[PDB]
Structure formats: structure tokens, C-alpha cells
Amino acid sequence: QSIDQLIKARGKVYFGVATDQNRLTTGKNAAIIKADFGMVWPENSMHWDATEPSQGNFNFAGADYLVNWAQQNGKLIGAGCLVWHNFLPSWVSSITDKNTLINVMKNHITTLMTRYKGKIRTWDVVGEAFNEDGSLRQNVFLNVIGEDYIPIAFQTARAADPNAKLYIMDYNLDSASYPKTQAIVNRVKQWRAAGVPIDGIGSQMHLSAGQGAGVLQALPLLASAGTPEVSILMLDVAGASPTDYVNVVNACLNVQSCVGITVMGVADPDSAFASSTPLLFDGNFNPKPAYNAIVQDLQI
Numbered sequence: 001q002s003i004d005q006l007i008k009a010r011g012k013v014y015f016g017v018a019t020d021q022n023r024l025t026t027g028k029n030a031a032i033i034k035a036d037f038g039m040v041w042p043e044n045s046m047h048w049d050a051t052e053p054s055q056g057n058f059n060f061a062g063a064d065y066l067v068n069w070a071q072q073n074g075k076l077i078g079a080g081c082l083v084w085h086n087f088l089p090s091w092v093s094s095i096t097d098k099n100t101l102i103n104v105m106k107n108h109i110t111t112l113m114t115r116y117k118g119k120i121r122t123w124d125v126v127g128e129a130f131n132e133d134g135s136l137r138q139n140v141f142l143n144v145i146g147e148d149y150i151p152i153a154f155q156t157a158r159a160a161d162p163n164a165k166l167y168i169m170d171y172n173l174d175s176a177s178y179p180k181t182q183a184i185v186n187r188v189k190q191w192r193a194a195g196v197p198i199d200g201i202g203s204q205m206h207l208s209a210g211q212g213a214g215v216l217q218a219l220p221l222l223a224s225a226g227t228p229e230v231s232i233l234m235l236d237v238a239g240a241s242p243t244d245y246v247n248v249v250n251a252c253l254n255v256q257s258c259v260g261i262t263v264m265g266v267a268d269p270d271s272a273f274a275s276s277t278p279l280l281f282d283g284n285f286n287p288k289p290a291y292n293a294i295v296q297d298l299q300i
Ligand SMILES: O=[N+]([O-])c1ccc2nn[nH]c2c1
Pocket: 017, 018, 041, 042, 043, 079, 080, 081, 124, 169, 232, 233, 234, 235, 262, 263, 264, 265
């Protein structure tokens, strides 16, 4: 059975997965995505160092392949992350002039979103902007532009493609009592009250064993910021316990504004954390206990 069709039957938008061209052309990934998933995200091909490795030199072959394959196979597309400190080329993190970095950020955002205008459901515009204590992360954008970079990024993205849902995403938002979780909620409330167009919060759920249960309290706390949507992104669970996975799926089902869930790849050997066997399909592309548990859960 298809977890995407089953989750749609429960009123959600999608069950999605990260992928890219060389997964689609190898293994059984294309077959499984076609059958079982409803949305795809670029695993690496929308990283800043993948798409703009030197200033104004844009590389879109990888992302084009993903977008075209998704359109051909009737899948939704999410993409990101436009502004974050990861996968940033040196040419960007060596900029010290505020106006230059603002326009470099804006051109990166606008060029990518314009190319795929109207084809992308969800864009992750700002990522990993928070420290663990809830203060803003001192990345090049904060250091050179200041805290206005976040409103600027979102405004720029809304202008480039007003059809896209625009998200802020972060990790370690998996416990309701953790400072980072309350902090992103507080800032997103205040940004939106000021007119900043943040449509969603995305929770990057790279989980340890037993952390699924806590998401049942954390996800509702995130939804309390009042964004139109929240989502679960980058999901994997060390050990891939059925209990952990079913708890995360149920958190999504419990939160009205949660639109769907994206897993961090299809089969275990293609995970960055392969030793931890954290995904829903094994090295022979068979559905694992966690996949079948999700099916059972989704089937007062
Ligand atoms: O949910 N995802 O797996 C995922 C993967 C890569 C991304 N880049 N921006 N947002 C992302 C989400």
C-alpha cells in the first residue's frame, strides 16, 4: 500500500521523500516514489554550492532533472533551502558589505524561484536560523546584514513566486520544553504580525531512537505560531522503530495545520546515517517493519 495515498485519505496533502537524479536512475527508487510518495524534494541539487558555486554562475541541471521528473510523474515538489549557513560557497561567506550581501541573497532567491515559478509547492526560504538557546544563529547573513535578513528573504521570495508556500525550517524542535522550540514560535508570531510572509514552519526531524513520542507535544507547539501550515521534513529515525515512526505520523495527523511529512530518502544504504538503518526501506528495497506499521496506522 501507498503511504501517500493513505495519508491523503486522512486529509493531509502528502507523504514525500528527498531524492535526486542518480537515485531516480538507480535501484528501485523511481518505482517506489511513483507508487508510494506524493512529493519530492532535492536531496542536494538545490544547495547553494550546487546551484551558484561562483557568483552568478548558476548550475541547474540537477534541480531541472528533479523538477522535470516530478512534473512527468505527477508529484508535488518542495525545494530549499535558499538561505542557511550550510552548503555555502566561500564567495558568499567572505562578503562583508551589507548592501552587497543583501542583493546576493536576493538574486539567489529570485533566480532559483523564478526558474521554477509556479511548479514548486513549498520553498524552504530560511533554514537553521536559531541557536540552541533560542537566540539567532550568527551566520554570515546575521553578521553582515543583521536580523532584518530574515524578513528581507521572505519578502523577496513572495515577490518571486507568490504561488509558493514559504517556510522557515529548523532542527531540534522535537521537544516542547526545549528553548529553541518556543523561541522559533515566538519570533515567527512577531515576524508575521509585522507583515513578513512566513506561510510555514518546517521541523527537520533527524531523530534518535525513542524521540518520536515527544513530537506529539512539540508539533502542536510549533503550530501555535499561527502559520497557515507546518510540516515534518528530513525525517529519519535511528533504528527505524515502528513506534517512533507511527508516533511522528500521528503527530502530523493530530495537528490540523500539518500538511505532510517528508522522509530523508528511500532506502537505508542511501542515508547519510546508513549504519543506523533509519529509513523505511532496506538495502534490498523491501518495506521495513516501520513502513508496514505506518500503513496499519493509516488504514473515533
Ligand atoms: O524534507 N526533506 O527531506 C528536505 C530535504 C532537503 C531540503 N532542503 N530544503 N528543505 C528540505 C527538505
